[PDB]
Amino acid sequence: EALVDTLTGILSPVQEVRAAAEEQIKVLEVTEEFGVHLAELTVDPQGALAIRQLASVILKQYVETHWCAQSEKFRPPETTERAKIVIRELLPNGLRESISKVRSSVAYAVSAIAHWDWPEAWPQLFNLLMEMLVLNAVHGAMRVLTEFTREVTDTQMPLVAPVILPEMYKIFTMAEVYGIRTRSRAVEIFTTCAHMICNMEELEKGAAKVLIFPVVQQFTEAFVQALQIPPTSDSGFKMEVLKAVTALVKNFPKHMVSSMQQILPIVWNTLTESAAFYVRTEVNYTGFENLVFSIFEFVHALLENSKFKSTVKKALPELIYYIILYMQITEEQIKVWTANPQQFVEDEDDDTFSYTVRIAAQDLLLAVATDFQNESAAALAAAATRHLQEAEQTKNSGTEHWWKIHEACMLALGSVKAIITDSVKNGRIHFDMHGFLTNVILADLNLSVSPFLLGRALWAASRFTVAMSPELIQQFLQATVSGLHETQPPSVRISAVRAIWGYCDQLKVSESTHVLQPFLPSILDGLIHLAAQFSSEVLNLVMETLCIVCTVDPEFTASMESKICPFTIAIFLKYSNDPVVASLAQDIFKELSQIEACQGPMQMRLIPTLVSIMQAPADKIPAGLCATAIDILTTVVRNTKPPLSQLLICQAFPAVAQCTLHTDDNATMQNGGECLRAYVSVT
């Protein structure tokens, strides 16, 4: 009746009606007939399901607030036993034949009730009946079990785990009636209980004791029985099983020592078969991603346990092949990257937040390399050679997707450049680096198969600069500089910019920059022209490469500062909000201020804009801009020669002084604080 109109208010946006309904809820709750009304509203069919969920969640609040006088969140109107025994047999009537929303909400409520009444032990077997009664009914009990086992404290756990876990194995082993999803949720329940029980054993022992520890063996054998099965072919189910096995490995290794030598081969078969299936169905395309991530997480965890460390090293050369097999760019990703270069710069970056199979494989490879540098280097060499051979074989036949193995091979061999190049320095392997660069990298710069291969080749030549002929260096740099042009697609341009970063870093560390010297003006012109086409993420990279280019040779910058300074200032103005843009601008100005020949023009062109930023009202210029201007000024003054310019003392000092005086922003005062502090460094 009118009991339900309030809830509609709770769902309404208008502030007044919502506040009124909320106060109606807060005032009527004290009556004991509340909970029965919530139940009769949420369980009854033929009603707006939103109201059902609302009643169920408010019932959760009720049970948390007016059920136990001992709870830290108790309210005066404690619940009478009549309403308790009424809802306790009227609430479970849900969990059935409805949309998963209201079922999960009613399950939330039940778990709230059952969280209190497991020790007092009312009949907690109505759901146990629903296990065998067929479907929607079972899903309700499964959600109930999940919520409850997530809710139980350390106290109830040594008592409820030896009760749920046996019935859990019963549900799992029975593959005739319980479908895939129900069994997967049972596995999730087991994993939750095991993780929390191991946490408890860490806190106060009692888990690995005379308790469920044998059931752990039972479930381990049940798992190792499951992975072989292709029905029950649900890949996500295999993912849940594998995640559970990872839990077992990481939590209590001691129990896993005996049977793991049987679990490893089936994991290996899963990895290989899934590699084939992925390359067929996602790479060359005219929850499986989660499965692949699960396999990789398992390998990661296997690398952790010291006793299990040598287990991977024995088969390492057989693993890196399939890793490199996974790092191929998928057709969907090619489409996206062609359609949105911003995404290409964000993803292929080496500090990204996206997580695709490619990135996970790259992480696995970097890990197994940094753990077994010599062995991993040898294995990567051998597997790269094998991939090269198979790629040439399938290239002679002219396969339409032969190059994606070249991309991944180059990526694997570059992303770990340190160990491989070091091993080649002492010849600990027999991988022909010169042959690699000539027949693999350079030879593929001339093809016309796909842009991304060209870009990956450019980026790959960057790492192995410490091992290449000067003629090779000139070849690669000439190709790269031609990469910044507009004639080429954007992706190869971006990759070429990254390659220029790599060159400017390696050669400088190699102290051989006179090879890059004749290429600077073309490089800088290409960089500048690129930054003016693309807006934000490409710029966030172009500016950093520009900073490194300035660091390359000061004389060139001193010659062409009239280009760097105006562009850098214009960008720092138009794109001032970004933090990395501000830091990059400050870095440019810092590296630029070392050049005494650039002092005059840099100051004359910058200090006016800086002070004009300082003079402006705090509510007129964009926020945070004053702080970055102050920091730029600090860098300029501190990183310059001791004798100060007339421009600074006549304009910068009084400008920043009055700015610090009349300002009120905490950040402004703070940053200006160091500004005036740095100013005291005058001799």
């Binding site: 946006p13 939103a50 969640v57 408010i58 609040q61 949105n340 926020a623």
Partner: protein, 169 residues
């Protein structure tokens, strides 16, 4: 014409009301005034093809000022978990916020964001965060004062709402 209700669930004093106001109309406000309950600030957006309404249902972080947690999530179409890059506690219960959020509304596109990129990005939480990895959770970093990605979460939600990744304001 179409109304898309979303929801913020940012724990603690991490910027949500500053965010919504700065998007609604105005600039950053320094003063901390914790919201008690929920205040919807209707926020419509024009697109290259169409027009989208995003009634932000800002919610309260702190416990005592909750009122009805999980109460207002019903009939949502997206949501923006939040935490500041400067605080450590605002992250370690993002799993809890997620479980409380995806339970009432089923798998709506949620964009775990991060506020105030200006101060110190990934300071005390960790230099990297592994929660958005496997799920349907697009991470980001925005600012309510600096106004850095301050259209990107809503762009992402609109794209994943109408479907076409070509929508632009």
């Amino acid at each position: 014409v179409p109304t898309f209700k979303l929801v913020l669930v940012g724990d603690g004093g991490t910027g949500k009301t500053t965010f919504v106001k700065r998007h609604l109309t105005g600039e950053f406000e320094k003063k901390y005034i914790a919201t008690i309950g929920v205040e919807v600030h209707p926020l419509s957006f024009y697109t290259n093809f169409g027009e989208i309404k995003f009634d932000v249902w800002d919610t309260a972080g702190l416990e005592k000022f909750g009122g009805l947690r999980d109460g207002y999530y019903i009939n949502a179409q997206c949501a923006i978990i939040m935490f500041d890059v400067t605080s450590r506690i605002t992250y370690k219960n993002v799993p809890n916020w997620h479980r409380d959020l995806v339970r009432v509304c089923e798998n709506i596109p949620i964009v775990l964001c991060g506020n105030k990129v200006d101060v110190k990005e990934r300071k005390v939480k960790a230099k990297t965060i592994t929660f958005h990895r496997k799920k349907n959770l697009q991470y980001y970093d925005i600012s309510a004062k600096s106004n850095y990605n301050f259209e990107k979460p809503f762009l992402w939600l609109a794209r994943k709402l109408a479907g076409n990744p070509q929508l632009e304001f």
